[PDB]
Ligand binder design. Structure first.
Ligand SMILES: C[C@]12CC[C@@H]3c4ccc(OS(N)(=O)=O)cc4CC[C@H]3[C@@H]1CCC2=O
Ligand SMILES: [Zn+2]
Length: 258
């Protein structure tokens, strides 16, 4: 019906409404670290978030997202494999019912407990709707989460999740600094791919950081208290909101690092 992550509407069903689900550059993928080629021509990523303006936090029935003002070049991604400048629109996460699954990308088949996606769009296309119709329209920065020590910079997010438990709910979420979610290293893998939820548009340059961040069990347990459902519907925990790895097909994953 309306798509989701369950047995009857999950990733294996998505191709019926979105036939590009079986396309040539679908995401996520398994990153086979020994086959990825070091590309010495790849530039360091430029992550310029000093002037980021967060606006809202929202439960959309498939994840939660923190939205940013993308009406000016305040929080931008450039360099790396990218041509031009990409504005930060939002970040969100994918996570599991248990710590051994939850990431969308895998690394030598290893699944992480969660994956953070910072979604940016190419300013040459003017708006994100236009950008999703272009093969170089979006750049998504992907960061793996493992469970161990807490991530202090994530705690402001975790603490408001009680206020957006169900689909439709949102809250003010100003002055959040996404730099507190980044690992030390910007070493990355990159490949051409797609959105990982409907409409699965093949518009994304994926930039996946090698270094995970650590979050605590308590932090990830708060993700797992969210609900896919609307407030007055049967409670169905928002867990396992990840798409599995898709066929690599005629693509090469490049590494920024040796
Ligand atoms: C809202 C949206 C549909 C959903 C699109 C989407 C879907 C999944 C998504 O997640 S992921 N995992 O691919 O980063 C990011 C976005 C950003 C652009 C979003 C689109 C911009 C215009 C539009 O109609
Ligand atoms: Zn995502």
């Amino acid at each position: 019906h309306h798509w989701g992550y369950g047995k009857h509407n999950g990733p294996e069903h998505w191709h019926k409404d979105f036939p590009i689900a079986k396309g040539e550059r679908q995401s996520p993928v398994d990153i086979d670290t020994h086959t990825a080629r070091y590309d010495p021509s790849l530039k360091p990523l430029s992550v310029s978030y000093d002037q980021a303006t967060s606006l809202r936090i929202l439960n959309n029935g498939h994840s939660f997202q923190v939205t940013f003002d993308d009406s000016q070049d305040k929080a931008v991604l450039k360099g790396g494999p990218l041509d031009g400048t990409y504005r930060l629109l939002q970040f969100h996460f994918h996570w599991g019912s248990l710590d051994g699954q939850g990431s969308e990308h895998t690394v030598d088949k290893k699944k992480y407990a969660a994956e953070l996606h910072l979604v940016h769009w190419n300013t040459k296309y003017g708006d994100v709707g236009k950008a999703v119709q272009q093969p170089d329209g979006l750049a998504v920065l992907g960061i793996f989460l493992k469970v161990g020590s807490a991530k202090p910079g994530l705690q402001k997010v975790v603490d408001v999740l009680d206020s957006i438990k169900t689909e439709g709910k949102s809250a003010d979420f100003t002055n959040f600094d996404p730099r507190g979610l980044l690992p030390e290293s910007l070493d990355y893998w990159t490949y051409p791919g797609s959105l990982t939820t409907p409409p699965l548009a093949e518009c994304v340059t994926w930039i996946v950081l090698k270094e995970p961040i650590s979050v605590s069990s308590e932090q990830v347990l708060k993700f797992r208290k969210l609900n896919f459902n609307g407030e007055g519907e049967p409670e169905e925990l928002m867990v396992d909101n990840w798409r599995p790895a898709q066929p690599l097909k005629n693509r090469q994953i490049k590494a920024s690092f040796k």
